[PDB]
Amino acid sequence: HSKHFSVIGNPFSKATQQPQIPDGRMLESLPRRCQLVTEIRNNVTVGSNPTYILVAPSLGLAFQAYQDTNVPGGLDSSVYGLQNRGCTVRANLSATSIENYNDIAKWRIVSQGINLKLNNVEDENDGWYEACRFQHDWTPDELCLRSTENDASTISQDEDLVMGVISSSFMNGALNTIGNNMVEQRGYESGLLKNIHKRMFQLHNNTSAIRPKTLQGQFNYGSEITFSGTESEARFTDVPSNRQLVDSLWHNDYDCILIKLYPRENTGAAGQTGSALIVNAIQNLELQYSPTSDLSTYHIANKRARDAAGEPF
């Protein structure tokens, strides 16, 4: 069980391609390492206002970034989801349901984290950051469904989806409040971007008894889920069905990480095009699949074994 402990806590760890939590709460589950690499750069429209990166325990979501250069259409944040990897739900608009097309019965997170590296030339390598972890009490009308495609079109039939926060949360909602009061948050850290590659930001569990969330094959929705006519976004009201859906897609046994960025401004002028971070998100999952699924046959017995934002990457 040594390799499992190496991966547990430390997502950036090539110890085993089969990471599981050995607590006996998921007998014969299936590991899944999902990795994503991308570039985060603050866009021109945010100006000198701070930007953000949110790492949340949502299923299939690597992270969410506010006012970077990949924001689609009229939305102010980008979702970086892990698609075509067997750990996403999709939009069965014809049946008006959220379809569990991979047939995941139960799921939890073995570990999750990001590492960021500044790649600007040394004459443009300024900017700083703060980071914290927190255990916010989410309401569904603060959350939303985003197409993993992160594109500028309405959510269409069979579109892959992940749960994110509404973009305005960064501007005037919960995440703005946390970002304005970072120093009082747990695990507070601050530093320069030129050094941020030394850090590994991993999610932490708020309990030692992490129970998997459950999912139905189809989750039928009424008018409480409003699909945008323009954006790739669907919004919730705070009603029982949306609370059930949030429970099934947002694992509340883990805390979130928020990184607030004061980057070099992006204006368009010659040497003034922002701060570019190479990002390396990883989400290590434990799944139980339903027999109808393709990935059912790869199940493997899992038998019981006997507070700072960043760590030294």
For 229, other C-beta atoms within 10 Å of its C-beta total 6
Q: Virtual CA dihedral for 74, 257, 56, 51, nearest 10 degrees?
A: 10
Among residues 234 and 277, whose Cβ is nearest to a copy of itself? Answer: 277
Among residues 127 and 234, whose Cβ is nearest to a copy of itself? Answer: 127
Among residues 3 and 171, whose Cβ is nearest to a copy of itself? Answer: 171
State the nearest-atom distance from the C-beta of 286 to a copy of itself, in Å.
12
State the nearest-atom distance from the C-beta of 297 to a copy of itself, in Å.
6
- CA dist 186 and 134 (Å) reads 6
Burial 190-227 (b: 16+ CB within 10 A, else e): eeebbebbebbbbbbbeeeebebbebeeebebeebbeb
Question: Which residue shows structure tokens 């009061």?
Answer: 181
State the nearest-atom distance from the C-beta of 265 to a copy of itself, in Å.
5
How far apart are the two ends of the chain, measured CA to CA in Å? 23
State the nearest-atom distance from the C-beta of 227 to a copy of itself, in Å.
18
State the nearest-atom distance from the C-beta of 61 to a copy of itself, in Å.
14
Q: Which of 206, 208, 310 is nearest to 258 (CA)?
A: 310
Among residues 3 and 176, whose Cβ is nearest to a copy of itself? Answer: 176
Among residues 204 and 234, whose Cβ is nearest to a copy of itself? Answer: 204
3-state SS assignment for residue 18: coil
